[PDB]
Amino acid sequence: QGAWDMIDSQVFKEPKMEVELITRFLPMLMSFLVDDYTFNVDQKLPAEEKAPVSYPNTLPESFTKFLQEQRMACEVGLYYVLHITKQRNKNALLRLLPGLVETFGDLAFGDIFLHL
Amino acid sequence: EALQKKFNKLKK
């Protein structure tokens, strides 16, 4: 991802990663996914009474902070959005659709993610 | 920790 940084100035050192990507962002993706499969198993389990609880559609905003402050977290979140769109789960989709509005380097608004 | 409790909640 830092390739243009290596051509702009001759940078031959490795770019560094984020810790909260490892401990907050990607575990937040995995947070949303395992709750997703939990309400799926609950739907596939009988005996749900009137007025069931929807999937939590609240958004942890440190996730969006990493989207809008880290290009790597940005683009991997974009491809996560595309993958869940291929899975087409409306609940998580509109859960994470806020916060994608403000994202790093307009990557959510770039050619790649928009085309996909 | 949240993740592991959601894991164990899905097992149930």
Side-chain angles (χ1 to χ4, degrees), chain A residues 55-74:
Chain A
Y55 173 56
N57 261 34
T58 177
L59 182 55
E61 301 302 330
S62 82
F63 186 94
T64 62
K65 175 176 78 79
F66 314 137
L67 269 167
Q68 67 214 12
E69 287 163 12
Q70 304 159 33
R71 59 193 176 285
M72 101 283 275
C74 200

Side-chain angles (χ1 to χ4, degrees), chain A residues 3 14 21 61 64 67 73 80 85 89 96 100-102 106-107 110:
Chain A
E14 317 185 309
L21 187 61
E61 301 302 330
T64 62
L67 269 167
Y80 173 76
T85 317
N89 205 250
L96 265 68
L100 284 165
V101 179
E102 167 47 48
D106 302 332
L107 289 169

Side-chain angles (χ1 to χ4, degrees), chain A residues 2-111:
Chain A
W4 184 89
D5 314 335
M6 301 199 157
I7 311 306
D8 183 18
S9 70
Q10 303 314 296
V11 174
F12 309 152
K13 188 183 282 187
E14 317 185 309
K16 299 307 308 192
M17 69 321 281
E18 182 69 45
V19 167
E20 300 182 308
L21 187 61
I22 308 157
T23 72
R24 305 291 298 169
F25 194 73
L26 307 164
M28 274 154 201
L29 301 169
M30 181 252 313
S31 307
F32 312 141
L33 294 166
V34 168
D35 294 325
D36 202 282
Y37 263 130
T38 310
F39 85 78
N40 274 55
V41 169
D42 297 339
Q43 300 339 113
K44 293 182 192 311
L45 276 165
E48 199 171 11
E49 290 174 353
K50 295 184 278 283
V53 70
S54 82
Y55 173 56
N57 261 34
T58 177
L59 182 55
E61 301 302 330
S62 82
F63 186 94
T64 62
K65 175 176 78 79
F66 314 137
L67 269 167
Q68 67 214 12
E69 287 163 12
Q70 304 159 33
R71 59 193 176 285
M72 101 283 275
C74 200
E75 205 70 28
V76 301
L78 294 185
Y79 278 85
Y80 173 76
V81 164
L82 299 167
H83 176 71
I84 64 186
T85 317
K86 280 167 255 187
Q87 302 179 151
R88 60 163 162 195
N89 205 250
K90 184 173 180 156
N91 295 97
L93 173 52
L94 304 192
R95 177 177 204 201
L96 265 68
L97 189 52
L100 284 165
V101 179
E102 167 47 48
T103 42
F104 195 90
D106 302 332
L107 289 169
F109 300 136
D111 307 334

